[PDB]
Amino acid sequence: AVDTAEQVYISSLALLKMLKHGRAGVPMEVMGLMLGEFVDDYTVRVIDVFAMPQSGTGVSVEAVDPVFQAKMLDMLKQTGRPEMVVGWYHSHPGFGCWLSGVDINTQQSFEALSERAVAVVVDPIQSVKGKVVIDAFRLINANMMVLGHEPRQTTSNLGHLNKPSIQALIHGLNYSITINYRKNELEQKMLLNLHKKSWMEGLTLQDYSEHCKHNESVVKEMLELAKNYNKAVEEEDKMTPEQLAIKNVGKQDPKRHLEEHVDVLMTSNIVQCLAAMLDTVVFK
Amino acid sequence: DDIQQLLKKINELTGIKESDTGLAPPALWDLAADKQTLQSEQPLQVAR
């Protein structure tokens, strides 16, 4: 009857489907019901999720049109499993990861249907590059008045890292259910450099004429770095060394222009020679 | 110089305040000047 630091496990395919469906319709807002298993009192797991065609004025109680809701969950069991509906996609393109009054009105009914169901919010715009803004939410009970501070409890266990975000504070806040991604070893065997490994392209020698031009392009400016290094080596002649050696700006030589260049030149000129000589004996 | 530097302290600590007017005295309608206001908010969506 009380929440805690509870972990929601979303499958890798589930996350991928969330992101793809969200980005497909970024200008609008999308909705997608979630299927999963109610593991135990502190572990709600969703194995796969399914989308609901973009109809209505938007995310609302219209996404649960029985004609479509029943027929998919049905055919889906025929092949696979019945994992009971546990949550919903939802999606806020440029609105952070907040929940609005309409969203609360919606999730109220879903909470009624279940007892602990969850509402996800996947941001398809902000989340790019190496960011995932997928935050999970639950409806604080209407008995707010006076009670043990929030239903969070957090007295059972200390899992609380990744404290609340910024925008949710501004908008309605105080749940922020913690989210942990499951990854089967096989599921990551693929989706790995199977996505980009190389295949057999290491034994490629690189355009030789190109190499002899890149090497000159790099060494010629290594010369300029050497001139600058001489200039900076005449420096430190006891005028204001401690302060000056640190206050001198200009990408101090042996840290950004004489070290990185040497490291790149070494790697390139050595990999080329190794490949060349390896092929000199692999093929006859 | 001490007098010149003292005037600055005096006005700094007695700075321009009590100018944030715009508040009717929540005494004439003090009773309604309360949760009734919140009831006014929330419902009654602001139109355009």
Partner: protein, 720 residues
Amino acid sequence: FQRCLDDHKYKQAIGIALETRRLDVFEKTILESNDVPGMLAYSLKLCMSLMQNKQFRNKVLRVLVKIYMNLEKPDFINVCQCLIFLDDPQAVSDILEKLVKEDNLLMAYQICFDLYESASQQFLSSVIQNLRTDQTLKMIKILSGEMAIELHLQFLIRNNNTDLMILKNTKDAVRNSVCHTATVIANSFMHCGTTSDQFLRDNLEWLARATNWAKFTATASLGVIHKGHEKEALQLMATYLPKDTSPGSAYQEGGGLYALGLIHANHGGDIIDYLLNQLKNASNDIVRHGGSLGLGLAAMGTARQDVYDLLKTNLYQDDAVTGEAAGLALGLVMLGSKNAQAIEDMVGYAQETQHEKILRGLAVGIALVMYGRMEEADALIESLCRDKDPILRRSGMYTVAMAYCGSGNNKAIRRLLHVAVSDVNDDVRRAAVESLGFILFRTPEQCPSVVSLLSESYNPHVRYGAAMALGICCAGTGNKEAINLLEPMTNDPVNYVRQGALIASALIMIQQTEITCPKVNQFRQLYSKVINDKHDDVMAKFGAILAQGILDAGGHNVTISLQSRTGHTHMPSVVGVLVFTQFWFWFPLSHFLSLAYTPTCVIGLNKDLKMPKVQYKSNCKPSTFAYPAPLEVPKEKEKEKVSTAVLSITAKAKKKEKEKEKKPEPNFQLLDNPARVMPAQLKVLTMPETCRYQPFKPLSIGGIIILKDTSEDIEELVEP
């Protein structure tokens, strides 16, 4: 060798023999000139410290016991310790039979005392069983440790000088944040077995405001507070039967069972059957947890098949909290055993299940199911460290930890550091360092260096780590090095990092005033400020309050040390430190810190049972002790005034008018008989010859020491 003998310097001979596996020359060096008849003591120390290969250490120590038996007057203490380490119940029974035949009562009583101080049940249990199969009755009673329980409980009560002003200050500064359990846990730690818990008795709205498992905190807080009262503990529980007002508060009954089980921590009797029946028939879900965590403690080390079956049946009945409770109970029930089938079944189920709490606890349960085998764990450690499930990997790390507790094994440290550098999961990354101390503790000199680097790394989840790692390494001593290292660590922007750091510091400076580390006051003031502020991290303040509560334990009498004064490691203390180190996964388990409290007292028992009065004195030069704790002032001052700044020509008139108007310490004091003696002075105290008796046992240790019996009709025959 003959050359060395000619040199007559036989220390080199003993060392070379012990290295070269020449037991012949080893026996010779002692059978030969026993110059410095403490050479036996040197052999003991150098064989119990700088020796690792158990296959040879056991042989060397057998030879040592042979020489000791072969001397004119065998040394009771040395023989008892050596037998305790050999685990030879038959030898112990033989020696007790021989002594009872000879009737050397002082040696007999001291032997029983030291045995119950050092060995573990199933060794004392074997001795008692053999002796069973009138004086013998008294010897068995003492060996069971019940008389010791009464004696040292009496000590704890009779020095129950606990403070409460800090308790009230924390009450006042405690908001409705999680600090409720923090204060309750501080009280529980303070009053460990003191039988004096008045604040909760006077006030009840606060101790009543909690939730299902918030209530589970107070029950076991009470249970700890009343450690060691097996006489009427069942009566106390019955007085707190759940059906007093309403049977719907199952949390209360589970907690009460938990408290009772801890109260019998490492003791059973009809309570074992009571708990067995209660678990067999009880409420549905939470009551199972209370029964399980009670049984686990009550049978801790017993390794009884019937309780094992009960716990097995409980666990294979999946449930969110019941599963984890049962897993822990199983681990405790079969500790230091290596039951092949036990490990097989436990590990298999850990693999099979899917509720991430039953296995969350089964990890520690399995890791505990084997203790300090020191070699017999490699199979399990490798098998678990190769697993896919991160929880099971953590479990394997804990098992590789306790399997080598008390030893500085190079391969173990290698494996732990490797896992802490090159793992993927944060729980594993932490458990790595957190379990590092359990191995680099017995010689807390190198853990400073072994931690001095990693304590500054990017991943705060792994920096927490060294905090508790040091906290356990330098547990009973304020090395003053961990103090320097952790001083900034109390100021990291990672709230949980500091939460760990504060508790580690508190354990590090436990009961030690500025004699060890001159910064105890600074750290306590820091803790007070951190608890005071309303803007500091909530869990950080929880950690700080836990540190404050654990700072002084049992009214400044009980300390933390995994090893006996003789150096024998204490299964309950080590298990408690491990269980607590499993802290920020389940707050309720925090009460296990009780088991690791080592009472610091001296018992000058003279009669069979009497505790004759004496007045010792101390002569320590540089160090005080014994309750400096000047915290005896309300320190409630308030000025609310403004200082003048009048500065004009009037200063001259003020000056002219003013002219016109104006024209014992401790370290050499005495001490009572059953008075706390800190280990810092257990070796520099003073022999009070005034009274009529003297302690036949050498006086460099603590613990109960039976004195020589002189003529009767002495003065002050008091037995409070």
